[PDB]
From a paper:
To investigate how [name] recognizes H4-NLS, we also determined the [name]-H41–34-NLS complex co-crystal structure at 2.82 Å resolution using a H41–34 peptide for co-crystallization (1-SGRGKGGKGLGKGGAKRHRKILRDNIQGITKPAI-34). The [name]-H41–34-NLS structure shows clear electron density for residues 13–20 of H41–34-NLS (13-GGAKRHRK-20). Notably, H41–34-NLS K16 binds to the second lysine-binding pocket of [name] in a similar pattern to H31–28-NLS. The same residues that participate in H3 K23 recognition (S505, S509, F512 and N556) form the binding pocket to accommodate H4 K16. Additionally, side chains of R17 and R19 from H41–34-NLS form an electrostatic interaction with E469 (repeat 11) and electrostatic/hydrophobic interactions with E593 (repeat 14) and Y664 (repeat 15) of [name], respectively. Conversely, we failed to observe clear H41–34-NLS electron density at the first lysine-binding pocket. Therefore, the crystal structure of the [name]-H41–34-NLS complex indicates that [name] recognizes K16 of H41–34-NLS mainly through the second lysine-binding pocket of [name]. A major structural difference between the [name]-H31–28-NLS and [name]-H41–34-NLS structures is the missing electron density of the first [name] lysine-binding pocket. This implies that [name] recognizes H4-NLS only through the second-lysine binding pocket. The H4-NLS K16A or K16Q mutation also reduced the affinity toward [name] although the effect was mild probably owing to the additional contacts generated by H4-NLS R17 and R19.
Numbering used by the authors:
A (entry chain C): 13 to 19
B (entry chain A): 39 to 72, 78 to 323, 330 to 630, 657 to 817, 829 to 961, 967 to 1068, 1074 to 1113
């Protein structure tokens, strides 16, 4: 979400 | 039946251990094995009142209790409760203490006949709780009262006379608490705190108005350092629980600032600095205090929690007491999560503060600064990064001279979160020295904990740098493959060993997003196979990292990734159907990412996913009904599948037919998928008490309506789901939704308001003039909200009004009423931010008005000019964004006004002030009416503009330079990471055509600009 991580 | 065998051993065994554990097993067996019942009964009573050690005494008592619940179901043993009552008032303190104990055990059985005895217990306990002989007797009485409270409430109508009695016993229970602490009885001090915690849950008729006063008391215990620490942790937990379950009572007393400052003082206490710096509990008061501030910031308005903390920021940050400097920093870092908007607005104070922490002499302060920055980056991602020019040199130095393993970790961890959100064009200046440092570090450090942090930082470089990472891509993967060997072999690997492997998978896949498939083609075959090996492994963390790799691969390869569906969807479905159980967090994380990978695959493999739709919705639907922590994510993923399906029907984002569909514009097959998810969405907001689930649901619904139009919520002229939706949304605005009904609000509650307002903004754009009938019930409420005590509520509402006006355009049959309201705001509101948002609406409504507004041009323009002039004064990035948005919104409004009724506006003083605030620094959508005005003014050869041509070209120089900077970023940035200068291609060409004429005229000064000369030709 506009960040690299998915958690 | 070995039941009597157990009691005989309980009574007569030579070893007390024996007699004790015999009675423990006897209790269990009573239920199953219970003619000579009375022989066993009398032996148990005798031993209970006579055994020397209370431990054996309690043993017999608990057997007696289970036995007594058995007989009361047969309505047998009528003498038990009456004898116990008699013994509780006996003259022997020891006899009373044992009688109360047995009664508590009876109440613990929850036998229904105890409901017949409410008055006896109330009368009895009202006495025994003050028993001067025995503190144990008083504590057991306090404990018994918790059960008596529940008993009185099971009744349909709680009996007032009882509740009055119970309400008077509360001050006595406080008295026992004082006793337990004076006597140093920690065991019973805990027990009594549990009784106080249980009072939070009771109805208000039973408790009186004591809740605030209880909190005030718990704070006074918690701040007093003479008290044992374990007792103080109890006190801080009790306040924390009060914020959760009884925040309404805390607000009435304005106890927020008390709570905050109390916990701030507790958190300033000496700690184990050596353990802090190297260790890798929350039963030391200073730490429980931070959990308090955390909960406080999430439950109360920032005026209650954050304003006090920030008021105390200057003095504690300069104190000579390192633990106060450490404290204020950690206090902030737990504040940002619940109050991120409030925190961001204090960046003028906070950023210099973290910079002070990084420069401290004491490493404990330095670690607090770092934790603070990490917390800032996690929640306000880009904003923290902007200050990289000062952070990066200070953080790098800390890595170089670090003397403790945890400082190094958080320095590396802070560097990561900065680079992660640093802007593409800024990281390039740094990319080479950081890459050499990051790899230099990765070599030197050998603990996997540190290497994992370096690996994440290195991947964050890739994320920021996008294309700019290709020179390092192969070099990096070469080094990193060493951490991704023997993936299936997990045995004999530590928790961190798996983490160093899991992160390497995740950040190698973030490199592929940065350098796209062409540069990734070399390693796709080995990596994809490794990732699939991880999915089949037995570590949830490792399977989870495989799913991360898949989801990122989906971004990189698109439809090329469809061949793998057959193998991957089976593993994804398996992961999601796992049992989640205490709860297994590793599985929860693994399920979140697998659901993400599922969504990413469906969006990527467009046509190929169709056979998987029914199964994926079936599996995801199941998790919504039955999952513990995946309901929100699982529902979001169901909508991503719909998005995939609609995208496959070549329904293009934004291209839906406006208005209410009398039938459907989606093929019957796709409409079935919409309706399935739509019912699940509606069912999880109706009578939903978790505000997380409502925000999440309202967000998904708002996005999907914006992308694909009203068919998301209604079809075939049947507005049943649309009406249910507005009921709930309007309910949230009234403050009366299930999740609200458990005047400054928490940012969470503010957010709930905004997403509901956004349900309307989205519908208005989707229905246009067909929106009016829905809007009618909400219009008074929203208008009402524009006049709220809260500046944040006002701003949200005025903004939503403006955006509704834009969706309805000239079919707005309420333009006049809306215009009158927003002009009142534009004129009379004390918040610049509110006046700025109002200016946007005012211009839109004027632009859509078909009636006569000549009357309001002079006052509105005088208010506009004043807003500009106060913003000119204020010209602290938080103020700068409001100042700059005011420039764009105000200039947009004037422009819309001049274009509407050019002749009611005096252009002589207006055009200069407008030019003076161009070019914009934000809100470039307000360029659109300004471009149209520049086009109109030149075609009329209007003198005021024609003498001002030089600034116009300078503005278009900047406009066009930014549009080409932006086009470059579009191709260089990492895949998946409003900067538009032009709102349409047509307006771009019209601006271009004008730039040519400007060249034909005026001696070609337009082409004298490198930037526009390139666009003119």
């Amino acid at each position: 979400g506009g960040a690299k991580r998915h958690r | 039946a070995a039941l009597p065998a157990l009691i005989h051993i309980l009574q007569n065994s030579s070893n007390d251990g024996i007699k004790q554990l015999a009675g423990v097993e006897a209790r269990k067996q009573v239920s199953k094995h219970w003619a000579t019942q009375t022989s066993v009964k009398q032996s148990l009573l005798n031993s209970a009142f006579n055994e020397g050690k209370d431990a054996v005494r309690h043993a017999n008592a608990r057997v007696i209790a289970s036995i007594g619940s058995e007989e009361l179901d047969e309505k047998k043993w009528p003498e038990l409760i009456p004898n116990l009552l008699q013994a509780a008032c006996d003259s022997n303190p020891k006899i009373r203490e044992t009688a109360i104990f047995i009664i508590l055990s009876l109440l613990e059985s929850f036998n229904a006949n105890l409901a017949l005895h409410i008055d006896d217990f109330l009368n009895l306990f009202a006495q025994t709780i003050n028993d001067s002989a025995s503190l144990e007797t008083r504590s057991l009485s306090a404990q018994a009262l918790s059960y008596v409270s529940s008993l009185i409430e099971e009744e349909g109508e709680i009996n007032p006379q009882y509740a009055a009695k119970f309400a008077s016993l509360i001050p006595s229970v406080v008295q026992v608490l004082d006793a337990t602490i004076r006597e140093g009885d920690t065991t019973n001090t805990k027990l009594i705190f549990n009784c106080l915690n249980d009072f939070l849950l009771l109805d208000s008729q039973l408790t009186g108005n004591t809740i605030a006063d209880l909190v005030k008391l718990a704070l006074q215990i918690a701040v007093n350092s003479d008290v044992d620490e374990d007792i103080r942790v109890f006190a801080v937990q009790f306040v924390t629980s009060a914020l959760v379950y009884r925040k309404s009572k805390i607000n009435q007393a304005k106890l927020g600032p008390e709570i905050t400052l109390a916990a701030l003082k507790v958190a300033s206490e000496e700690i184990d600095v050596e353990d802090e710096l190297t260790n890798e509990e929350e039963n030391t008061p200073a730490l429980t205090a931070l959990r308090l501030i955390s909960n406080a910031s999430g439950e109360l308005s920032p005026s209650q929690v954050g304003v006090p903390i920030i008021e105390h920021l200057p003095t504690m940050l300069s104190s000579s007491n390192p633990f106060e400097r450490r404290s204020i920093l950690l206090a902030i870092s737990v504040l940002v999560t619940g109050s991120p908007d409030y925190t961001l607005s204090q960046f003028d104070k906070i950023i210099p503060a973290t910079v002070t922490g990084l420069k401290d002499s004491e490493a404990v302060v330095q670690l607090a600064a770092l934790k603070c920055i990490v917390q800032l980056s996690t929640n306000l991602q880009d904003e923290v990064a902007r200050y990289h020019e000062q952070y990066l040199p200070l953080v790098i130095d800390i890595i170089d001279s670090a003397k403790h393993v945890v400082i190094y970790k958080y320095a590396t961890l802070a560097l990561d979160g900065l680079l992660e959100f640093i802007a593409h064009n800024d990281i390039i200046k740094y990319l080479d020295p950081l890459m050499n440092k990051l790899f230099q570090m990765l070599e030197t450090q050998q603990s996997p904990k540190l290497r994992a942090a370096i690996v994440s930082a290195i991947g964050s470089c890739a994320f920021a740098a996008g294309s700019g990472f290709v020179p390092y891509f192969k070099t990096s993967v070469q080094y990193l493959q060493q951490f991704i060997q023997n993936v299936s072999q997990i045995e004999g690997l530590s928790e961190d060993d798996i983490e160093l492997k899991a992160l390497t998978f995740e950040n190698i896949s973030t490199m592929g997003r940065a350098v796209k498939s062409a540069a990734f083609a070399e390693y796709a075959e080995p990596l994809v196979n490794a990732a699939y090996e991880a999915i089949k492994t037995d570590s949830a963390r490792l399977r989870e990292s495989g799913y991360a790799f898949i989801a990122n691969m989906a971004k990189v390869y698109g439809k090329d990734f469809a061949p793998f569906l057959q193998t991957i969807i089976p593993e994804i479905f398996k992961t999601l159907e796992q049992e989640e159980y205490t709860v297994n967090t590793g599985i929860a994380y693994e399920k979140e990412v697998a659901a993400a990978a599922l969504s990413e695959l469906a969006i990527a493999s467009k046509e190929h996913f169709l056979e998987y739709v029914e199964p994926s919705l079936k599996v995801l639907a199941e998790q919504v009904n039955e999952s513990y922590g995946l309901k929100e994510t699982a529902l979001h993923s169901m909508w991503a599948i719909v998005k995939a399906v609609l995208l496959t029907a070549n329904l293009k984002e934004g291209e839906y037919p406006k208005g209410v569909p009398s039938g459907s514009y989606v093929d019957a097959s796709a409409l079935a998928v919409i309706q399935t998810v739509r019912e699940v969405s509606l069912n999880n907001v109706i009578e939903e008490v978790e505000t997380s689930m409502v925000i999440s649901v309202f967000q998904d619904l708002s996005e999907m309506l914006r992308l694909f139009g009203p068919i998301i919520i209604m079809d075939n002229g049947d507005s049943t789901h649309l009406d249910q939706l507005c009921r709930e949304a309007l309910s949230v605005l009234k403050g009366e939704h299930a999740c609200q009904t458990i005047l400054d609000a928490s940012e969470t509650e503010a957010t709930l308001l905004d997403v509901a307002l956004d349900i309307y903004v989205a519908l208005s754009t989707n229905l246009v003039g067909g929106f009016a009938q829905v809007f009618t019930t909400a219009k008074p409420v929203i208008l009402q909200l524009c006049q709220s005590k809260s500046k944040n509520k006002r701003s949200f509402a005025v903004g939503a009004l403006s955006e509704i006006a834009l969706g309805m355009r000239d079919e707005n049959p309420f333009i006049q009423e809306l215009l009158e309201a927003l002009i009142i705001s534009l004129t009379n509101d004390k918040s610049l931010e509110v006046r700025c948002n109002a200016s946007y609406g005012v211009g839109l409504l004027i632009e859509y008005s078909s009636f006569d507004v000549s009357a309001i041009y002079s006052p509105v323009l005088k208010s506009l000019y004043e807003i500009l002039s106060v913003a000119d004064e204020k010209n602290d990035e938080a103020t700068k964004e409001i100042v700059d948005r005011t420039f764009s919104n105000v200039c947009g409004c004037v422009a819309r006004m001049i274009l509407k009724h050019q002749n009611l506006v005096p252009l002589e003083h207006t055009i200069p002030a407008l030019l003076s605030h161009l070019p914009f620094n934000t809100a470039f959508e307000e360029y659109d009416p300004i471009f149209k005005l520049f086009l109109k003014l030149f075609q009329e050869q209007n003198s005021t503009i024609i003498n001002e041509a030089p600034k116009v070209i300078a503005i278009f120089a900047t406009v066009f330079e930014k549009e080409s900077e932006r086009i470059e970023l579009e191709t260089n940035s990492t895949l998946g990471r409003k900067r538009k200068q032009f709102q349409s291609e047509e307006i771009k060409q019209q601006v271009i055509e004008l730039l040519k004429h400007l060249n034909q005229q005026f001696n070609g000064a337009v082409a004298q600009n490198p930037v526009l000369a390139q666009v003119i030709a």
